[PDB]
Design a protein around this ligand. Structure first.
Ligand SMILES: [Mg+2]
Ligand SMILES: [Mg+2]
Ligand SMILES: [Zn+2]
Ligand SMILES: [Zn+2]
Lengths: 1167, 89, 74, 49
């Protein structure tokens, strides 16, 4: 079968050095002149940087001279001015070239930090520059005389050396010399030479540096690049329209900076060509060559020299490297990120009438957005003769179009987005609902997922055009398909504030109210009692209820009983579908219970019942809350009657301690701390006085004498329900507020004795100011810290995707409850939920298989384990997954917005990184958010501990030399370990004990590098997750341990060989590659040997550095260095990753595209 | 409208292979090649295909099967026309 | 030190300035040099006959008086 | 929707024709990046098929 020639759909990419002949291949002409346009008739001057002959017609399908103006004429080259008449588009495509008189060095291979040309020749950089500026002569191919091949001479020395040997020795200077060296260099011969020397001299100093060079050289050899090409003979010119001269208003012109640069290189080049035929003296043509060299450099990458400035403008002219480069990497892919058609935005509002699957869309917005669709539907039914008439119709806004828009709108989701998109719920698909008015209406339940308040925040809309985009939006991005956080399995659609105050006020009970004691047949006549004004919403009542339990085998049982309840809970029962028990609604229904209600409904009846349920809860929540007439008055905030007395007593204490300091009974420092404590203690007293009074002091009577219940006071209901406010914030309203802190951080020993219900005087407010401003500053900065963190995270993960089904490893990590020092800071059930078992678990007794090998532990399974006393469970994790280049679905877990096991192909790295980064706003400024980063950066603490390197008996040897050596001695194994530990650090280690490898030989923090090395992989991963999770959980943030585990797996991706037989001994390399390769030896070729490696721990930012794809690396890394370092090796990017596929603009090799890439990836390496 | 695609995801597990298959089907209907297998409520092809997945009358196998039949159904017509290309000889 | 302004100022700074008499020294040599090639040119027979063949083209209106001579010595 | 100067028009015509598809092609931003790299001394090619 024939291969191909013309444009097929390409896979992979290649990058390499460009030969002068290769550059000529692209070039359709030589730019011989600095001229641009004619200066009167604005036509391009032949043949200059803008040329119709070299590049293309100024206007579509028309010859420049004007002889051939006809659209028929296409392959025609005008006889007057050779211009083949074709679309002006080719002026954006066709390249050109310039033939340089003298060779010229490429600054990138000269000036990228490891000068490539320098170490290719094993020659210093400063010397090469010394040869380039004609500041000395360098030898080439010295022959047998006096001189080294690479030796450098000065003017007189070259002369002195020349009188003795005229010929059979050669030396040049400048660029031509360097080019001659590169051409003369034989890598093959040099490679052999380098191979012997490694073996001959044995020294680490020697062979360390030695080995680095030989692999590099042979890489360049196998690459196919010829060294000479680092020196430019021919220089390609970029198509004119990519650096346009386009006119402006008022007749002025504007142009890219490259022209000024290109023009210069041309002038100088041309001048030099002239100076050769005039036989100018050396001193000039030399100067002209340096000037040309500088000029080319300024063109390619400006700023590696003097930084030439554009004409008449101080600001330096932008060069080609700066066009690619930026902040950060490429502008193209950097945020932001390309503008997109079919979009819009406006201020957003509520719309509680909406169902959860839809959103209010302004009439005009939908009109302008679906404009092409409207045209097509309008001319599909024949209401418009043609598209033009259709254009006029919607432009006329004839009334008839509105019905047509409801058709084109109906089943057609739109994407809604908020400004800081953090997790994937930052974008969700909705069904359009036509709205008069310019505001976007957004279903209330989603406002939590977006973090969208209504304080004037704006949202952006996107229309999913292609059929595949409509179905992606509906089956993935739809609102109803994500009700559960992917970060933690808990529902994110939990009713927010107004609704839960409604349901809290609804299911609540007072002691004596209308309808107290009566009984009703069912919720129907309960509402009939209430709505008619007979019964109070909260009164204790028995009513007949029918609950349901599906406790049969997939089958619903029914049960009826007399439940003791209130009227509101009875009324509320009408919404609860089928198999939920009345127990869930028989309580007071705070914000905490109302989410777990939704959670259980999902985990039992599935999705569909849960969605419509959520809707109903919101509707009834708002409604009854409106009935409740909740408000806030100034008398709703009750100050304790005992406040002034408490302040005075604490005011007496400071005067006790003060008398003690004047009389010297207590020290000054002791004074500060003493007073601060009593004032602090005072605050707790006032807080817990007003809390008691505020909470229950409503004291009311039913028929009998008195009694007292939880208050119905307005502000309390908000805080108890979970609606808004918290005991801390309330404490500032009624009780005194806090002790503020001066900028210094030293909390002032005279707190704020007033509160907001009273007035704050001048001093108290002024002192309050610092806390606010530092708060805003801290948060506004904590905003910045979070973003960078998610960035580093997604860069190191990203390309990680679920690929295989079951790697089929029994391996996994042991899950126990966290038990931090007290009682159960986190249960076992949350830690293990939704994960898969490593091996079958036994009861406390045995011959009992509870869970059979690998089984997803769902709610029943976790409860069956909890029924029993089960204390410990080993679980497959993404860190242990045997699948290479991805995660096996079994090792990850089920978690998603759906409860089912994770699908094949979901990109989990991103959702893991996003889930970890998003909550980061709430962390503090040890502790806080920077503490998390230290964990993920693997950073070694300042004064770490040291762990026993190897098991066996240890002892001390030699004596204080600034380090006192420690000798460990295994019984059987070799003794030789003696480490020099500074002894001025307090030891722990019993001097006379045998130490298990990895014990604490001193105190202080430990480097996670050790834990991986000494204790093992599972130990360090357990260490990271528990420490980082300590930070979040301390703030009340729920992040499943899974996500942290995947980041960890990426930290240790690389390993360092120990044994040999096929690989590089000391090479750091992917354990993916090694593991697939040692399987290729265990039964393949030679056993050979081998090889044993050692897993390594890389910080997140360092591990993301290594990426196979250079297009990906060129994005977020330093672009110049990436391209150079890649261009020399002739590295071939196969795509395969995410980052790169986004760049080239094809299907992401994940999700919907994962089927595609898979189908294509296999087509490769076949026939 | 189709509020939740859950029923289709049960029918096809992946939930991604669902988007693809329903897509392939929606084009068989949208570009005017076939007609629906289930009452159309005025729902656009997006949802009509999804109802077809939920009701179990459409999946990757049938389409590949169905398409594979049409390959031979059209190949039967052109039978005389392309065998007339004996002009190779 | 890079900055070609500097490596120029310094490459030329080596060349030493001419004395008022020294200017004439080099200049006398110039005349001598050219006169040698002029005399060397005068000694070529084809160089003569060609000019003959060229002037017959001038009088035949195959050239112009400006395209051959700029005027003589007299 | 943004960068494909061919695909965008080829798309628009399909939207009115009633065919929701895309004949995507290659984004012009990246297509320019090829020339900027190639405008330097770098030969960057799209291999295979
Ligand atoms: Mg908010
Ligand atoms: Mg806001
Ligand atoms: Zn012409
Ligand atoms: Zn696995």
């Amino acid at each position: 079968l024939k291969a191909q020639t013309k444009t097929e759909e390409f896979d992979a990419i290649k990058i390499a050095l460009a030969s002068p002949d290769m550059i000529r291949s692209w070039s359709f002409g030589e730019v011989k002149k600095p001229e641009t346009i004619n200066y009167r008739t604005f036509k391009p001057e032949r043949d200059g940087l803008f040329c119709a002959r070299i590049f293309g017609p100024v206007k579509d399908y028309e010859c420049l001279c004007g002889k051939y103006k006809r659209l028929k004429h296409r392959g025609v080259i005008c006889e007057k001015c050779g211009v083949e008449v074709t679309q002006t588009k080719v002026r954006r495509e066709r390249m050109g070239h310039i033939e340089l008189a003298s060779p010229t060095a490429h600054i990138w291979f000269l000036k990228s930090l490891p000068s490539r040309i320098g170490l290719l020749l094993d020659m210093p950089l400063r010397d090469i520059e010394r040869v380039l500026y004609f500041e000395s002569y360098v030898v080439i191919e010295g022959g047998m005389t006096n001189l080294e091949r690479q030796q450098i001479l000065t003017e007189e020395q070259y002369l002195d050396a020349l009188e003795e040997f005229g010929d059979e020795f050669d030396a040049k200077m400048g660029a031509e010399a360097i080019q001659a060296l590169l051409k003369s260099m034989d890598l093959e011969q040099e490679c052999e030479q380098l191979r012997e020397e490694l073996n001959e001299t044995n020294s680490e100093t020697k062979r360390k540096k030695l080995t680095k060079r030989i692999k590099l050289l042979e890489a360049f050899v196998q690459s196919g690049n010829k060294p000479e090409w680092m020196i430019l003979t021919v220089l390609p010119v970029l198509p004119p329209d990519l650096r346009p001269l386009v006119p402006l208003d008022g007749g002025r012109f504007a142009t890219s900076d490259l022209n000024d640069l290109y023009r210069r290189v041309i002038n100088r080049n041309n001048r030099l060509k002239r100076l050769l035929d005039l036989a100018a003296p050396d001193i000039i043509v030399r100067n002209e060559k340096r000037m040309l060299q500088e000029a080319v450099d300024a063109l390619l990458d400006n700023g590696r020299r003097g930084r030439a400035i554009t004409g008449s403008n101080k600001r330096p002219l932008k060069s080609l490297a700066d066009m690619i480069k930026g902040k950060q990497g490429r502008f193209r892919q950097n945020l932001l990120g390309k503008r997109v058609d079919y979009s819009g935005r406006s201020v957003i509002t509520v719309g509680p009438y909406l169902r959860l699957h839809q959103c209010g869309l302004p009439k005009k917005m939908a009109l302008e957005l679906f404009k092409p669709f409207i045209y097509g539907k309008l001319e599909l039914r024949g209401l418009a003769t043609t598209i033009k008439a259709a254009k006029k119709m919607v432009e006329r806004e004839e009334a008839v179009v509105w019905d047509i828009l409801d058709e084109v709108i109906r089943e057609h989701p739109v994407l809604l987005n908020r400004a800081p998109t953090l997790h994937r719920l930052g974008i969700q698909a909705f069904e359009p609902v036509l709205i008069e008015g310019k505001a976007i209406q957004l279903h209330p339940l989603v406002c939590a997922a977006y973090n969208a308040d209504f304080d004037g925040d704006q949202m952006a809309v996107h229309v999913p055009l292609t059929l595949e985009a409509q179905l992606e939006a509906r089956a993935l991005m739809m609102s109803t398909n994500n009700i559960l956080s992917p970060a933690n399995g808990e529902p994110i659609i939990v009713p927010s504030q107004d609704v839960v105050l409604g349901l809290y006020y609804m299911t609540r009970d007072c002691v004596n109210a209308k309808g107290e004691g009566m009984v009703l047949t069912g919720p129907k006549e309960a509402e009939r009692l209430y709505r008619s004004g007979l019964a109070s919403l909260h009164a204790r009542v028995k009513v007949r209820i029918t609950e349901y339990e599906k406790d049969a085998n997939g089958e619903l049982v029914a049960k009826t009983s007399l439940k003791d309840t209130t009227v509101g809970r009875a009324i509320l029962w009408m919404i609860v579908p089928k198999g939920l028990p009345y127990s869930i609604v028989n309580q007071a229904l705070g914000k905490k219970a109302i989410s777990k209600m939704l959670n259980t409904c999902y985990r039992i009846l599935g999705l569909k019942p849960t969605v419509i349920f959520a809707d109903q809860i919101m509707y009834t929540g708002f409604a009854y809350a409106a009935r409740s007439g909740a408000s806030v008055g100034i008398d709703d905030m009750v100050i304790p009657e005992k406040k002034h007395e408490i302040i005075s007593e604490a005011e007496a204490e400071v005067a006790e301690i003060q008398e003690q300091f004047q009389s010297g009974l207590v020290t000054a420092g002791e004074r500060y701390n003493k007073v601060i404590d009593i004032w602090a203690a005072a605050n707790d007293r006032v807080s817990k006085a007003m809390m008691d009074n505020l909470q229950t002091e409503t004291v009311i009577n039913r028929d009998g004498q008195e009694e007292k219940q939880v208050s119905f006071n307005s502000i309390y209901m908000m805080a108890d329900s979970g609606a808004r406010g918290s005991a801390a914030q309330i404490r500032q309203l009624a009780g005194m507020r806090g002790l503020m802190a001066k900028p210094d951080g030293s909390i002032i020993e005279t707190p704020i004795t007033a509160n907001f219900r009273e007035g704050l005087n001048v001093l108290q407010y002024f002192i309050s100011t610092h806390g606010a401003r530092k708060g805003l500053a801290d948060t506004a900065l904590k905003t910045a810290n979070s973003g960078y963190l998610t960035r580093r995270l997604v860069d190191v993960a990203q390309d990680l995707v679920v690929t295989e089904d079951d790697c089929g490893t029994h391996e996994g990590i042991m899950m126990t409850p966290v038990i931090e020092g007290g009682d159960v800071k986190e249960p076992l059930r949350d830690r293990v939920l939704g994960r898969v078992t490593a091996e079958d678990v036994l009861k406390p007794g045995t011959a009992d298989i509870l869970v059979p090998r690998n089984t997803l532990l769902h709610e029943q399974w976790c409860d069956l384990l909890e029924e029993n006393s089960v204390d410990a469970v080993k679980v497959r994790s993404v860190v242990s997954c045997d699948t290479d280049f991805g995660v096996c679905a079994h090792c990850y877990g089920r978690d998603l917005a759906r409860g089912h096991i994770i699908n094949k192909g979901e990109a989990i790295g991103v959702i893991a990184a996003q889930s970890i980064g998003e909550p980061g706003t709430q962390l503090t400024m040890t502790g806080g958010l920077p503490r998390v980063a230290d964990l993920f950066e693997a950073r070694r603490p300042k004064e770490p501990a040291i762990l026993a390197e190897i098991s066996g008996i240890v002892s001390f040897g030699k004596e204080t030399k600034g380090k006192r050596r420690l000798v460990i001695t295994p019984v059987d194994g070799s003794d030789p370990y003696e480490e020099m530990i500074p002894k001025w650090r307090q030891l722990n280690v019993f001097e006379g004990e045998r130490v298990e490898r990895g014990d604490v030989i001193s105190d202080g923090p430990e480097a996670p590098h050790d834990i991986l090395r000494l204790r093992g992989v599972h130990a360090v991963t357990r260490y990271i997750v528990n420490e980082v999770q300590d930070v979040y959980r301390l703030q009340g943030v729920k992040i499943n341990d899974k996500h942290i585990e995947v980041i960890v797996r990426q930290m240790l991706r690389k390993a360092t060989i120990v044994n040999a037989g096929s690989s590089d001994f000391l090479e750091g390399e992917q354990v993916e590659y090694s593991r697939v390769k040692i399987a290729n030896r265990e039964l393949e070729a030679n056993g050979k040997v081998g090889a044993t490696y050692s897993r390594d721990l890389l910080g997140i930012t360092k591990a993301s550095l290594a990426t196979e794809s250079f297009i990906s690396a060129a994005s977020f890394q330093e672009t110049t260095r990436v391209l150079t370092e890649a261009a020399v090796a002739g590295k071939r990017d196969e795509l395969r990753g995410l980052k790169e596929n986004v760049i080239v603009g094809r299907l992401i090799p994940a999700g919907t595209g994962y089927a595609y890439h898979q189908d294509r990836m296999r087509r490769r390496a076949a026939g | 409208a189709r509020v939740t695609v859950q029923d289709a995801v049960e029918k096809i597990g992946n939930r991604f292979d669902l988007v693809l298959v329903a897509a392939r089907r929606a084009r068989q209907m949208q570009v005017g090649g076939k007609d629906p297998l289930v009452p159309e409520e005025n729902d656009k092809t997006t949802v009509i295909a999804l109802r077809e997945i939920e009701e179990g009358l459409i999946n990757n196998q049938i389409l590949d099967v169905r398409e594979r039949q049409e390959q031979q159904e059209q190949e039967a017509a052109e039978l005389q026309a392309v065998t007339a290309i004996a002009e190779g000889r | 030190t890079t900055d070609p302004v500097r490596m120029y100022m310094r490459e030329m700074g080596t060349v030493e300035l001419l004395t008022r008499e020294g200017e004439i020294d080099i200049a006398k040599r110039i005349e001598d040099g050219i006169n040698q090639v002029q005399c060397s040119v005068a000694e070529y027979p084809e160089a003569i006959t060609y000019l003959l063949e060229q002037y017959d083209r001038v009088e035949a209106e195959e050239a112009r008086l400006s395209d051959l001579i700029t005027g003589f010595v007299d | 929707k943004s960068d494909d100067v061919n695909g965008r028009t080829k798309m628009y015509k399909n939207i009115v024709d009633g065919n929701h598809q895309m004949e995507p092609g290659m984004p012009e931003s990246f297509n320019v990046l090829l020339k900027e790299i190639r405008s330097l001394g770098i030969n960057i090619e799209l291999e295979d098929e």
